[PDB]
Amino acid sequence: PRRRVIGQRKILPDPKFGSELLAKFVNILMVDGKKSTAESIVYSALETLAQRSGKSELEAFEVALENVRPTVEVKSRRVGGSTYQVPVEVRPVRRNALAMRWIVEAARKRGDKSMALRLANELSDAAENKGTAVKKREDVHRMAEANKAFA
Amino acid sequence: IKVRENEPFDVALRRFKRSCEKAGVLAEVRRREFYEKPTTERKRAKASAVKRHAKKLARENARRT
Amino acid sequence: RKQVSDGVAHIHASFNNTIVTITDRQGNALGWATAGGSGFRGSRKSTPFAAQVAAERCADAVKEYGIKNLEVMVKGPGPGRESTIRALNAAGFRITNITDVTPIPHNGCRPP
Amino acid sequence: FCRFTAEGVQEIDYKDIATLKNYITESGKIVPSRITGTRAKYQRQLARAIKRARYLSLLPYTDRH
RNA sequence: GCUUGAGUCUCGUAGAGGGGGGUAGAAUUCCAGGUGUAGCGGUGAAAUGCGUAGAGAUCUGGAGGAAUACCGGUGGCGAAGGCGGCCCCCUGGACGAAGACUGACGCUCAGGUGCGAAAGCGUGGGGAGCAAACAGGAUUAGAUACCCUGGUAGUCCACGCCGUAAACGAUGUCGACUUGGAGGUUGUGCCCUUGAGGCGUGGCUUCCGGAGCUAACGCGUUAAGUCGACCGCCUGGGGAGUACGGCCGCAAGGUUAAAACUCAAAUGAAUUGACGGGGGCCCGCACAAGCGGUGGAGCAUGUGGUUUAAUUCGAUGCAACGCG
Numbered sequence: 001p002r003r004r005v006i007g008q009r010k011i012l013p014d015p016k017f018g019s020e021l022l023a024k025f026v027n028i029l030m031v032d033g034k035k036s037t038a039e040s041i042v043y044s045a046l047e048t049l050a051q052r053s054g055k056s057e058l059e060a061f062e063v064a065l066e067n068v069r070p071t072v073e074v075k076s077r078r079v080g081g082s083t084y085q086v087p088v089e090v091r092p093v094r095r096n097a098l099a100m101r102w103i104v105e106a107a108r109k110r111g112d113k114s115m116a117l118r119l120a121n122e123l124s125d126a127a128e129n130k131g132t133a134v135k136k137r138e139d140v141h142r143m144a145e146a147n148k149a150f151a
Numbered sequence: 152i153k154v155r156e157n158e159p160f161d162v163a164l165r166r167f168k169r170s171c172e173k174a175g176v177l178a179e180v181r182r183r184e185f186y187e188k189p190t191t192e193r194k195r196a197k198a199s200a201v202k203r204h205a206k207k208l209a210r211e212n213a214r215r216t
Numbered sequence: 217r218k219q220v221s222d223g224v225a226h227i228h229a230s231f232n233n234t235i236v237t238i239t240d241r242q243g244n245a246l247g248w249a250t251a252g253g254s255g256f257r258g259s260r261k262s263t264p265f266a267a268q269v270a271a272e273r274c275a276d277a278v279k280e281y282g283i284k285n286l287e288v289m290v291k292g293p294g295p296g297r298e299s300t301i302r303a304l305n306a307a308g309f310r311i312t313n314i315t316d317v318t319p320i321p322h323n324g325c326r327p328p
Numbered sequence: 329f330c331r332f333t334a335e336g337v338q339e340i341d342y343k344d345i346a347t348l349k350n351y352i353t354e355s356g357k358i359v360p361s362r363i364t365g366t367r368a369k370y371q372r373q374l375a376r377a378i379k380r381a382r383y384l385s386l387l388p389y390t391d392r393h
Numbered sequence: 394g395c396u397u398g399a400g401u402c403u404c405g406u407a408g409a410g411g412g413g414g415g416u417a418g419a420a421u422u423c424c425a426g427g428u429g430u431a432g433c434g435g436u437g438a439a440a441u442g443c444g445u446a447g448a449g450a451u452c453u454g455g456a457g458g459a460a461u462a463c464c465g466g467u468g469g470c471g472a473a474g475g476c477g478g479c480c481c482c483c484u485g486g487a488c489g490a491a492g493a494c495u496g497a498c499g500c501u502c503a504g505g506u507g508c509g510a511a512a513g514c515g516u517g518g519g520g521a522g523c524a525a526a527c528a529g530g531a532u533u534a535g536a537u538a539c540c541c542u543g544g545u546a547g548u549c550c551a552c553g554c555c556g557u558a559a560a561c562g563a564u565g566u567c568g569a570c571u572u573g574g575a576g577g578u579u580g581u582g583c584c585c586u587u588g589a590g591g592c593g594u595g596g597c598u599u600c601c602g603g604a605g606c607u608a609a610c611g612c613g614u615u616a617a618g619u620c621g622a623c624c625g626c627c628u629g630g631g632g633a634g635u636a637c638g639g640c641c642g643c644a645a646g647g648u649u650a651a652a653a654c655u656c657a658a659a660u661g662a663a664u665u666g667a668c669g670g671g672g673g674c675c676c677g678c679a680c681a682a683g684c685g686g687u688g689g690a691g692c693a694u695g696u697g698g699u700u701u702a703a704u705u706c707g708a709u710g711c712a713a714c715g716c717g
Contacts, residue, residue, distance in 0.1 A: 002676070076681075081437095149265045152355050152419090153315050153391055163301065165314070171355065176419065176462050177293050181231065182328045197467065198599095201576085205600070208575075226451050230421095232434075237451040245428035245451055252449085253431040259438075277429095289452085292420080316392060317452080320419045323460055325548090327421095327523035329589055356418085358464050365589090368468080368578075369407070375464065379479055382417080389418045 008093065016043065019058055025100045029119075045119040052124060060123070067129035068099045068136075074143045087144045087151075099137075106132035217280040220246070225286040225304060227271075229296030234267035236274040236300065238286060246281045249273035264299035271303035285310035291318050331365030333374070340370060342377045345386050352378065356390040 014023040022042065029038040046057040053060050074085040090098070107115070107122045110132060125131025154167055220240050228235045237248035251270035252261055260266060286309055290297050304311060332347065333340055342348065351359045351366070351374055358378055361371045381387045 149268070153313060155313055156311075161305075163298070165298065167354075168298075171353075171357070171463080172419070173297075180326055180462070181293060184326065184328070193465080194467065201467075201600075205575080228450060233450055235450045239428075239452060243427080243452040248429060248451070250430065250432075250450080252433060259436080318420060319392060320462075322418070323458075324420065325459060325522060360464055376479075383479070392419080
């Protein structure tokens with residue numbers, strides 16, 4: 001807020017093998033608060049991803065996120081006059097959460113059969129970085145590299 | 152105005168310009184001679200300077216610090 | 217194209233425009249480009265990035281002449297005069313010296 | 329405070345350009361009296377000697393020629 | 394007759410003091426020449442205007458023109474207005490040390506005389522950049538204004554006219570006395586220059602404050618304190634610093650200067666609320682990021698308005714509209 005310097009809260013780890021980042025991926029999937037359905041969809045999508053790729057559940061999801069991981073992002077910081085976008089490096093806690101948000105936002109569209117199949121197909125397309133969330137990343141990168149001279 | 156800043160430089164470092172010429176005599180003559188107001192702003196600037204000097208001469212107080 | 221060895225990059229920075237124009241030692245120009253031909257129609261003309269892209273589009277279309285190093289001759293007031301010369305560094309040129317070749321009036325009157 | 333003209337008998341002349349060069353900068357401009365002493369009588373005589381040496385091309389007006 | 398008033402001479406000091414004659418440095422403009430390209434110009438944004446004839450711009454050469462960024466300082470000079478490279482000539486005024494001379498020649502001034510910011514007027518010239526008036530383009534319900542692009546008088550030299558300014562430290566000129574501090578500037582005496590210092594005496598000037606004064610703010614040893622000499626102005630506001638008359642001026646106009654009529658107010662610095670498209674600091678999902686809605690469709694409810702003989706009454710900008 002304005003003065004409050006409170007930090008992030010400590011969420012519960014996932015009831016599968018211990019990884020808090022995929023628990024945050026469970027947390028940002030969640031329509032209508034339905035956490036149990038979100039955990040079932042994440043679990044089934046990680047099994048159908050580890051089956052089609054041959055990797056584990058913690059390392060196929062590891063290299064699915066660095067292809068949707070943005071480098072810098074733009075935000076409006078005007079200083080006395082004209083309003084221009086400012087490219088800046090994002091903090092990693094915001095970075096990986098926004099990348100998972102991009103994965104889920106790409107998973108909301110492109111409806112093949114069901115939500116677990118959509119999430120597995122989005123992670124499979126982010127494996128060889130030709131899907132939709134990597135296009136969101138390349139669009140955020142196109143917002144930079146030409147408006148980069150303002151610093 | 153003139154500097155060489157020899158070959159292992161990779162940067163301008165032209166601090167001699169802004170000390171003398173670059174702004175203080177440049178963005179004052181593009182408009183508004185004013186015909187009097189240089190004398191008025193010189194009066195106001197030296198008044199502010201002598202009041203700041205008289206305040207710094209009397210700045211020694213308690214001040215709770 | 218004459219295969220000239222060096223040149224002199226005269227830069228005119230103003231509140232109007234920021235040109236970069238490269239002549240030889242004897243003072244006939246070898247190719248140049250404007251900050252207005254480089255895009256930015258209208259309000260973004262008086263930005264230093266317009267001077268940067270003017271120096272960028274001056275850096276090319278002169279490779280037939282083959283200029284290695286250059287002298288920098290700034291001229292005029294304005295928001296430029298300091299940001300475009302770094303565009304003369306990243307584009308593959310060697311700066312010799314930065315000078316100015318203009319006097320003030322030798323008895324002249326300036327309005328508002 | 330360390331002026332060479334305050335105890336400086338045989339007042340500052342235009343011919344001796346070795347000591348007269350120390351009161352101009354690199355761009356030929358006159359060094360102010362707010363930096364190097366040079367009380368106002370000897371400062372005005374110094375400015376006269378500077379510009380009468382600039383007239384005789386003993387010291388440059390500037391490096392813009 | 395005398396000298397402490399005033400004045401003159403001797404030795405010097407500082408100054409943008411004035412007048413005349415010349416020489417020179419941080420860049421928009423015009424012309425010519427080489428170059429080479431797609432737009433230039435401003436604003437919150439936009440256009441007029443300039444441009445493929447090749448613009449704004451690139452270097453060189455030339456042309457003229459009224460003027461001094463740095464030094465530069467509530468720093469200095471001049472009675473005031475005002476005056477700011479430098480060189481040459483003329484010339485005034487101010488101040489300091491030891492003296493020498495006249496002996497009240499001294500202060501103020503109605504009338505009168507001279508100087509007098511800028512704007513303007515007349516003649517002979519210059520005209521580069523701006524710039525009233527004027528044109529075009531933007532904003533607005535309207536804009537003949539604030540904004541922009543051009544542009545004439547003028548801003549400018551020689552000689553006159555006009556004599557007006559918020560010509561204001563709003564404080565008339567001269568003399569005397571009156572605690573003080575911090576300074577700036579300019580001389581001089583003395584001390585060991587024994588080391589960029591120390592102790593005093595004169596002029597001008599800035600700020601703060603003692604007594605005192607003032608309606609207050611504030612002035613405060615250059616007083617608005619206490620006095621003495623003289624000149625000018627006022628008896629409420631509007632009318633009105635207007636009209637008539639006299640004088641000056643080529644004109645614009647200026648000086649002097651009423652009356653009739655209306656009102657019981659006008660005004661004066663200062664304090665407290667309000668406000669500033671005034672700042673500094675702080676706060677609230679107030680703004681930034683994000684989520685879900687309204688306004689696009691249909692149903693429940695209320696209001697405005699219409700009709701009726703009634704469509705009971707109140708609330709009716711946030712602070713009324715699923716309210717009573």
